[PDB]
From Swiss-Prot, chain C:
Role summary: One of the primary rRNA binding proteins. Located near the base of the L1 stalk, it is probably also mobile. Required for association of the 30S and 50S subunits to form the 70S ribosome, for tRNA binding and peptide bond formation. It has been suggested to have peptidyltransferase activity; this is highly controversial. In the E.coli 70S ribosome in the initiation state it has been modeled to make several contacts with the 16S rRNA (forming bridge B7b, PubMed:12809609); these contacts are broken in the model with bound EF-G.
Residue ranges, compositional bias (Low complexity): 38-47
The name this protein goes by in its record: Large ribosomal subunit protein uL2
Species this protein is from: Escherichia coli (strain K12)
Keywords: Acetylation, Ribonucleoprotein, Ribosomal protein, RNA-binding, rRNA-binding
A single MF term (Gene Ontology): structural constituent of ribosome
GO CC terms: cytoplasm; cytosol; cytosolic large ribosomal subunit; DnaA-L2 complex
Modified residues (N6-acetyllysine): K241
Region ranges (Disordered): 27-52, 220-271
Length: 88, 55, 271, 117, 103, 54
RNA sequence: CUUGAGUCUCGUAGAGGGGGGUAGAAUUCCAGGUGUAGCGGUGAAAUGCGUAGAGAUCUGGAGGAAUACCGGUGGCGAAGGCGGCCCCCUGGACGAAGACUGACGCUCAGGUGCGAAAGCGUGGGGAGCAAACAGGAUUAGAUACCCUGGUAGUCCACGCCGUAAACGAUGUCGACUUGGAGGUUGUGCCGGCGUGGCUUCCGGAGCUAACGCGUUAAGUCGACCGCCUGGGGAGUAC
RNA sequence: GUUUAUUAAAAACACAGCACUGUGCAAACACGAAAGUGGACGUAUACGGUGUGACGCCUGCCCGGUGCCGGAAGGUUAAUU
């Protein structure tokens, strides 16, 4: 999956601690990076149905986490989505 | 199932050794297993039936 | 790329057309064209010999190399072009010394490949070799019947032959009709299959789309008079006769081959 | 005609018939005889006694070659596997090897459907 | 940047021109920032069963740590080089620097 | 287990060339699978005979 | 706030999914070499094949389909299902010590997606097997069971179909409730002592009309959903 | 779309589509006492003959007769001697 270097970079640059690996923003960043990466894999592999399920699970989990962040704090929510370049 | 014949080894001993080799390798049984076709459902059914009879 | 046209007109309702988006779009190479005039199915006496021929679009002849005689000089394919004189496409090549020629396009050949002819040529599509250096069992096209003459077998679009044996000084081929023939082992052949396999997936669609090819209408035998065809005549729709060609020869079932000087090379009939 | 002194006996015994041939080391055949090619026709055509008779007559048919050594190759699950070997040995011959070459697919091809009897 | 076992057997009659070329392979590896961990020449051996009417073959084993694309190009070279009759590239989990059972 | 230890792999092959069951030799479950993989790797690599007929 | 839920570090086994390449055995066909009168098939027979040289045997070539042994009341998968070997891409599960977010959770009508075999459309492919079909037998008859041949189909790429005794005839999530005999996969201490996950058989209280289930419940409970209301007519008609 | 110029323009001819069949190239076939020529400067996804007539569902039973293809155990049978 995601390389150790990429995850280390995103958590050491994007979270509010040296070892912050559990915040909502960090999770959303990891899921969006993995989704963007797997888009390329699924471009050439239409008939891969047993990984489409994992991709759908990641999408749903990202949606629920963003729902929670919107419900709790809206300002940092908008900050996160503008950093990540998303719509909702 | 190759069986040779040596000096001071009579006919019947070599014949019995060849028969034992054939029995061990199960050549005739394996041939008679591929006589016809078997539905995979029947394969799994007979396998489980034998396994539950053994228990 | 077989595409079906939308039925905006009665003549376009049934049309299916094969478009290749790789053919050269401009004009052909100038020093390799000639002139031909349509005959209409008429010989030097002016009489009609073959019926249902006449008219059509004008064409020019392209000098295609069927010998590949020059050897030891690699060549690079320049581009693929459309030839109206046949059913396959032709690919212009540029030899290392500066000479250009037309060859038949094998299957899978594109611009930027390399070809080669001779006795040391590599075994890959596009090359041509005598059938004694070619591995038995392979598939070839543009075969010769006589050593030195030129490519004369399996030359249409999509066709090919297969070498099945080598009985000393000869080879045995399985032709597209199923007939097995013996040819000299010194005849050359070209590796691969001739391209444009989508030729028979084309529907002409209308009556006038066959007159662009120069094909005049066919009149049925029973629709004639007793003085014109053996089948002609009747009050209504009457046949009562064994089917025959317009000249009396039986047309449905009868064999017509008669050639005793080449029957020695026919291993078996197509049947 | 020719002298070899060591051939190879090929036995092909199936559920209905047994065919016995003798060849050279290079594969070239010399003579043959079958259980059904000996008058045993129908149900008796497969019984091992027919195999023994076929082996004996086939051995007698190769009296002009003068062979003293043999190998045997056994094929098929037919009943003619032991009787043929004994007949070959007891025909005045001498076998120095025994080998089974029955073909066995390693999967291959779908067999005919089961006989509903 | 992964470890690999590379085994190949080559025609015995070409044995006299095997050594130098494997160096080139090593060179290629060392040209692509790859690491050689072990290289043993098993030599001429009798095959367990005849391969295309041959009986002997020259077996050579190489131990590499290299990126995947270099292994891909090496595999293509092995495919086209008619001298070698067979080859096999196995991806391992760690370095296997030791004495092989052959020697 | 590796395919390069042919001497030990000899002990787990029948006379014909097959693979002995686990219950006959009493070995474990995982080692049987790894052994079978090694045997197949060696059989492809022309180190072991596929069959016995010749 | 951290006990529910999830992220990070390490490692573990696996027919989990997709793409490409490749090794052996075997049936069929084709071309050569020896050899001559049978081969094949049934309970018994013949249609069928063979003197233009079959069948048997040896060397070689082509093509297609499936991977002997290992092999397991084994393993993976949400379900249908998944098996020779190697590389590339990729999903899930699990285990020891710890760090992190702090209820972010469960179920689900509409909706979206996957979905054995057969069947359809377009284009390739065709070794074996084999609906329809042809002939030989059996029989009072035999549109079959038996025998010899054989076209769709079975194979691949794409797009449809959306059905099965699609079954554990048992909806998903969580909590509590005597035991025994095993299989498989991780970890700690000195063959033993603990500890988790998945699974097979027997059986106690309890439950059921009974058969039986029984810590993987059909036992004691909470949440949400789906479905049932006599048999034909009928899963039919509009 | 074509047709009986000058009493018949139609349901008649043609047609895209389907099938049977012949043809291995000095191709089958046609015009020629012959040489030659068309087919074709094309090579079985090509050419000739025959019937039916877009598209949809489909196309059953009969090989005695008359044709065509294949077989040769027997009978009769020309020129020749
Ligand atoms: Mg015509
Ligand atoms: Mg026509
Ligand atoms: Mg017409
Ligand atoms: Mg008229
Ligand atoms: Mg006239
Ligand atoms: Mg007339
Ligand atoms: Mg009329
Ligand atoms: Mg009438
Ligand atoms: Mg009439
Ligand atoms: Mg032969
Ligand atoms: Mg806190
Ligand atoms: Mg749900
Ligand atoms: Mg619903
Ligand atoms: Mg289809
Ligand atoms: Mg089709
Ligand atoms: Mg149900
Ligand atoms: Mg019910
Ligand atoms: Mg499970
Ligand atoms: Mg109940
Ligand atoms: Mg119980
Ligand atoms: Mg309905
Ligand atoms: Mg009009
Ligand atoms: Mg007019
Ligand atoms: Mg008029
Ligand atoms: Mg008028
Ligand atoms: Mg008509
Ligand atoms: Mg009809
Ligand atoms: Mg008739
Ligand atoms: Mg008749």
């Amino acid at each position: 999956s995601l390389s150790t270097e990429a995850t280390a970079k995103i958590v050491s640059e994007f979270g509010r601690d040296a070892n912050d690996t559990g915040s909502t923003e960090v999770q959303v960043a990891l899921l969006t990076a993995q989704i963007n990466h797997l888009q390329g894999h699924f471009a050439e592999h239409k008939k891969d149905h047993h990984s489409r399920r994992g991709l759908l699970r990641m999408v749903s989990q990202r949606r629920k986490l963003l729902d929670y962040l919107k419900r709790k704090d809206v300002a940092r929510y908008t900050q996160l989505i503008e950093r990540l370049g998303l719509r909702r | 199932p190759v069986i040779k014949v040596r000096e001071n080894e009579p006919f019947d001993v070599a014949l019995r050794r060849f028969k034992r080799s054939c029995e061990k390798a199960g050549v005739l049984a394996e041939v008679r297993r591929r006589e016809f076709y078997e539905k995979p459902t029947t394969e799994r059914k007979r396998a489980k039936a034998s396994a539950v009879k053994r228990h | 790329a077989v595409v079906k046209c939308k039925p905006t007109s009665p003549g376009r309702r049934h049309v299916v057309k094969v478009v290749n988006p790789e053919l050269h779009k401009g004009k052909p190479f100038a020093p390799l064209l000639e002139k031909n005039s349509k005959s209409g199915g008429r010989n030097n006496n002016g009489r009609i010999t073959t019926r249902h021929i006449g008219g059509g679009h004008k064409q020019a002849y392209r000098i295609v190399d069927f010998k590949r005689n020059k050897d030891g000089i690699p060549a690079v394919v320049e581009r693929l072009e459309y030839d109206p004189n046949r059913s396959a496409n032709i690919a212009l090549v540029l030899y290392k010394d500066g000479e250009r020629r037309y060859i038949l396009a094998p299957k899978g050949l594109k611009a930027g490949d390399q070809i080669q002819s001779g006795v040391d040529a590599a075994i890959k599509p596009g090359n041509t070799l005598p059938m004694r250096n070619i591995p038995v069992g392979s598939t070839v096209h543009n075969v010769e019947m006589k050593p030195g003459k030129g490519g004369q077998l399996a030359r249409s679009a999509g066709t090919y032959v297969q070498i099945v044996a080598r009985d000393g000084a000869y080879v045995t081929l399985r032709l597209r009709s199923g007939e097995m023939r013996k040819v000299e082992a010194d005849c050359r052949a070209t590796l691969g299959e001739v391209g444009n396999a989508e030729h028979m997936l084309r529907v002409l669609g209308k009556a006038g789309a066959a007159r662009w090819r120069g094909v005049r209408p066919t009149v049925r035998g029973t629709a004639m008079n007793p003085v014109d065809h053996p089948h002609g005549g009747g009050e209504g729709r009457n046949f009562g006769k064994h089917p025959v060609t317009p000249w009396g020869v039986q047309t449905k079932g009868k064999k017509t081959r008669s050639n005793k000087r080449t029957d020695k090379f026919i291993v078996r009939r197509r049947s | 005609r020719k002298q070899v002194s060591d051939g190879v006996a090929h036995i092909h015994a199936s559920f209905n018939n047994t065919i016995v041939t003798i060849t050279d080391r290079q594969g070239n055949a010399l003579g043959w005889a079958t259980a059904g090619g000996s008058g045993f026709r129908g149900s008796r055509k497969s019984t091992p006694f027919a195999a023994q008779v076929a082996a004996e007559r086939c051995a007698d048919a190769v009296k002009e070659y003068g062979i003293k050594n043999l190998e045997v190759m056994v094929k098929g699950p037919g009943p003619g596997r032991e009787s043929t070997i004994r007949a070959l040995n007891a025909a005045g011959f001498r076998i120095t090897n025994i080998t089974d070459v029955t073909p066995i697919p390693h999967x291959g091809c779908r067999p005919p459907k089961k006989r509903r009897v | 940047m992964r470890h690999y076992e590379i085994v190949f057997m080559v025609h015995p009659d070409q044995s006299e021109q095997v050594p130098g070329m494997i160096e080139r392979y090593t060179a290629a590896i060392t040209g692509a920032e790859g690491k050689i961990h072990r290289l043993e020449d098993w030599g001429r051996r009798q095959l367990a069963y005849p391969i295309n009417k041959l009986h002997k073959a020259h077996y050579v084993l190489m131990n590499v740590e290299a990126p995947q694309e270099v292994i891909d190009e090496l595999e293509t070279t092995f495919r086209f080089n008619d001298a070698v009759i067979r080859s096999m590239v196995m991806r391992t989990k760690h370095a296997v620097t030791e004495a092989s059972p052959m020697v | 287990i590796d395919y390069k230890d042919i001497a030990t792999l000899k002990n787990y092959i029948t006379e014909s060339g097959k693979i002995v069951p686990s219950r006959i030799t009493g070995t474990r479950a995982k080692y049987q699978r790894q052994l079978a993989r090694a045997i197949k790797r060696a059989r492809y690599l022309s180190l072991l005979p596929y069959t016995d007929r010749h």
